[PDB]
Design an enzyme around this catalytic site. Structure first.
Site, mmCIF file in Angstrom:
data_model
loop_
_atom_site.group_PDB
_atom_site.id
_atom_site.type_symbol
_atom_site.label_atom_id
_atom_site.label_comp_id
_atom_site.label_asym_id
_atom_site.label_seq_id
_atom_site.Cartn_x
_atom_site.Cartn_y
_atom_site.Cartn_z
ATOM 1 C CG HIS A 133 42.679 46.826 39.822
ATOM 2 N ND1 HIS A 133 41.703 47.626 40.380
ATOM 3 C CD2 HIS A 133 42.178 45.567 39.832
ATOM 4 C CE1 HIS A 133 40.666 46.883 40.726
ATOM 5 N NE2 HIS A 133 40.929 45.628 40.411
ATOM 6 C CG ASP A 171 36.566 43.764 37.013
ATOM 7 O OD1 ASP A 171 36.599 43.890 38.267
ATOM 8 O OD2 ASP A 171 37.249 42.912 36.406
ATOM 9 C CG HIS A 173 37.351 44.077 41.918
ATOM 10 N ND1 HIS A 173 37.422 42.905 41.200
ATOM 11 C CD2 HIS A 173 37.260 43.717 43.220
ATOM 12 C CE1 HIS A 173 37.381 41.878 42.032
ATOM 13 N NE2 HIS A 173 37.285 42.344 43.267
ATOM 14 C CG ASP A 264 35.486 40.570 38.586
ATOM 15 O OD1 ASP A 264 34.780 41.362 37.927
ATOM 16 O OD2 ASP A 264 36.639 40.852 38.955
HETATM 17 O O1 QI5 Z 1 39.717 40.892 39.780
HETATM 18 C C1 QI5 Z 1 40.291 41.733 40.370
HETATM 19 N N1 QI5 Z 1 40.290 43.056 39.791
HETATM 20 O O2 QI5 Z 1 39.633 43.296 38.573
HETATM 21 C C2 QI5 Z 1 40.985 41.437 41.704
HETATM 22 C C3 QI5 Z 1 40.427 40.502 42.554
HETATM 23 F F1 QI5 Z 1 39.284 39.851 42.187
HETATM 24 C C4 QI5 Z 1 41.022 40.219 43.770
HETATM 25 F F2 QI5 Z 1 40.485 39.297 44.613
HETATM 26 C C5 QI5 Z 1 42.174 40.866 44.143
HETATM 27 F F3 QI5 Z 1 42.759 40.581 45.337
HETATM 28 C C6 QI5 Z 1 42.743 41.795 43.305
HETATM 29 F F4 QI5 Z 1 43.885 42.417 43.717
HETATM 30 C C7 QI5 Z 1 42.149 42.085 42.086
HETATM 31 F F5 QI5 Z 1 42.710 43.009 41.270
HETATM 32 K K K Z 2 34.020 48.379 37.551
HETATM 33 ZN ZN ZN Z 3 37.719 42.526 39.150
#
Ligand code: QI5
Ligand code: K
Ligand code: ZN
Ligand code: K
Length: 354
Positions: A133, A171, A173, A264
Site C-alpha cells: 500500500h 494479498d 487487498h 488475508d
Molecule cells: O491488510 C491490509 N492490507 O494489505 C489492510 C487491512 F487488512 C485493513 F483492514 C486495513 F484497514 C488496512 F489499512 C490495510 F492496509
Molecule cells: K492483491
Molecule cells: Zn491485505
C-alpha cells in the site's frame, strides 16, 4: 536446489502503543517462523540474513520527502508519533517502525540477490511491516515503504535495468502503491487479485478495477483481477490463475517473480472474508514456480489470523522446497466468472495468449 529463508525477530519491534491488539501484530512474523520450525521446514532452508535498506535504495521508489519524514519518526515522542500516524490512512508508528521497515526491505534485497546470483533457487521473506500500500510519497494501510516494488528495482540495479520482473499480489487487498509505482513501466508486470466490491473494499479506490491496464509504455503491464459479491476461495483463485495469471505471465516471460504474498484472503482471516485454504496457496505457489526458471521470492504482506497465515505461508515454503502439492478439495461463484471475463476482454488486446 536450495530455498532461502529470511526472518529477523527485530522486525517485531514495530508496534501500536495505543491499541496493542491492532491486527498487524508483532507476533505475525514470529508465528510464521515458529510454524516453520515445528514442521521441520526451517532446517531444510538456507538462512539469509536480514539487513537495513539504505536511503539510496529507498530512493529507487520513494521521494526524499517521504523518506525524511518516516526517518524522523525514529526520535519522536509518543504524542508526536500518534499525531504523525493519524495523518496517514491507516498507519500506526512507534520509535522502531522506520528501522523495521528498513529491515523488511533489506531482507528482501538480500533474498533477491541470493536468487539472482544462483545461491538459492527461490526464497521466502517473513517480514513486517508490509509494503504494497505504500506509495512513492506517502505511507498507507500499515505500509511505510513498498518492499516488493523496491525489491524489483533493486534486482534490476544488480542485473540490468530492463530485467523483466513479475509481481503477483495475492494479498486480498489491491496493492495501490505497487500499481502506481510501475503504472508506466513495461519492465515490471503487476498482477493483483483482490476483493473489490465495486470500490467499497479497502483501499477504497476505483484504481483497482479491471480496466486499469497501465499507462504509456506500461499499457498492458498492469493486470487487476477484482472480486465482487462472493466469498471467493480456491476454485475462483485456481480459475483466475488458469485463465489469466499464468498465460499472461508465460507470455511476459519474467526473469524474476516476486509474490506480494498477503495471507488475508485465507479461510479464517478476520478482515478478508474469503476462504483460500493452505493447499490453495500451495497450488498457487507451485504454479508460479514454473516461471523464471523457478526464481520466485515470496514476500509476506498482510494476513491477520495467526494460525491461518502460519499454515498458509509454511505450505508455500514447502512447495518452494520441492514438496509435492497437497490435494485440493466446486463451480465458480457466478460473479467470479464475470470478473475473469472482464479482465480477459480488457487484456486480450495486449496478450495474444488470451
Ligand atoms: O491488510 C491490509 N492490507 O494489505 C489492510 C487491512 F487488512 C485493513 F483492514 C486495513 F484497514 C488496512 F489499512 C490495510 F492496509
Ligand atoms: K492483491
Ligand atoms: Zn491485505
Ligand atoms: K506495470
Amino acid at each position: 536446489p536450495i530455498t532461502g529463508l529470511v526472518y529477523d525477530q527485530r522486525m517485531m519491534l514495530h508496534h501500536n502503543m495505543w491499541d496493542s491488539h491492532h491486527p498487524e501484530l508483532p507476533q505475525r512474523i514470529s508465528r510464521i517462523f515458529s510454524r516453520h520450525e515445528e514442521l521441520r521446514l526451517l532446517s531444510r532452508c538456507h538462512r539469509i540474513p536480514a539487513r537495513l535498506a539504505t536511503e539510496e535504495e529507498l530512493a529507487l521508489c520513494h521521494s526524499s520527502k517521504h523518506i525524511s519524514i518516516i526517518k524522523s519518526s525514529e526520535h519522536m515522542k509518543p504524542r508526536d508519533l500518534n499525531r504523525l500516524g493519524d495523518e496517514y490512512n491507516s498507519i500506526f508508528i512507534s520509535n522502531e517502525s522506520y528501522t523495521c521497515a528498513l529491515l523488511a526491505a533489506g531482507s528482501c534485497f538480500n533474498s533477491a540477490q541470493a536468487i539472482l546470483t544462483g545461491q538459492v533457487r527461490n526464497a521466502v521473506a517473513i517480514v513486517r511491516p508490509p509494503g504494497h500500500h505504500a506509495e512513492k510519497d506517502t505511507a498507507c494501510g500499515f505500509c511505510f515503504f513498498n518492499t516488493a516494488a523496491l525489491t524489483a528495482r533493486y534486482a534490476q540495479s544488480i542485473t540490468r535495468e530492463s530485467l523483466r520482473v513479475l509481481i503477483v499480489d495475492w494479498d486480498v487487498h489491491h496493492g495501490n502503491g505497487t500499481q502506481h509505482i510501475f503504472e508506466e513501466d513495461d519492465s515490471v508486470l503487476y498482477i493483483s487479485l483482490h476483493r473489490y466490491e465495486d470500490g467499497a473494499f479497502f483501499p477504497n479506490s476505483e484504481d483497482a478495477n479491471y480496466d486499469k491496464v497501465g499507462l504509456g509504455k506500461g499499457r498492458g503491464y498492469n493486470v487487476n483481477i477484482p472480486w465482487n459479491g462472493g466469498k471467493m476461495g480456491d476454485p475462483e483463485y485456481m480459475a483466475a490463475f488458469h485463465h489469466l495469471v499464468m498465460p499472461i505471465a508465460r507470455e511476459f516471460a519474467p526473469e524474476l517473480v516476486l509474490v506480494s504474498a498477503g495471507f488475508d484472503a485465507a479461510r479464517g482471516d478476520p478482515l478478508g472474508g474469503f476462504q483460500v485454504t493452505p493447499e490453495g496457496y500451495a497450488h498457487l505457489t507451485h504454479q508460479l514456480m514454473s516461471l523464471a526458471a523457478g526464481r520466485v521470492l515470496i514476500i509476506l504482506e498482510g494476513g491477520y489470523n495467526l494460525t491461518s497465515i502460519s499454515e498458509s505461508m509454511s505450505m508455500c515454503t514447502s512447495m518452494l522446497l520441492g514438496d509435492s502439492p497437497p490435494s485440493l478439495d466446486t463451480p465458480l461463484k457466478t460473479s467470479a466468472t464475470v470478473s475473469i471475463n472482464n479482465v480477459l476482454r480488457a487484456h486480450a488486446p495486449f496478450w495474444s495468449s488470451l
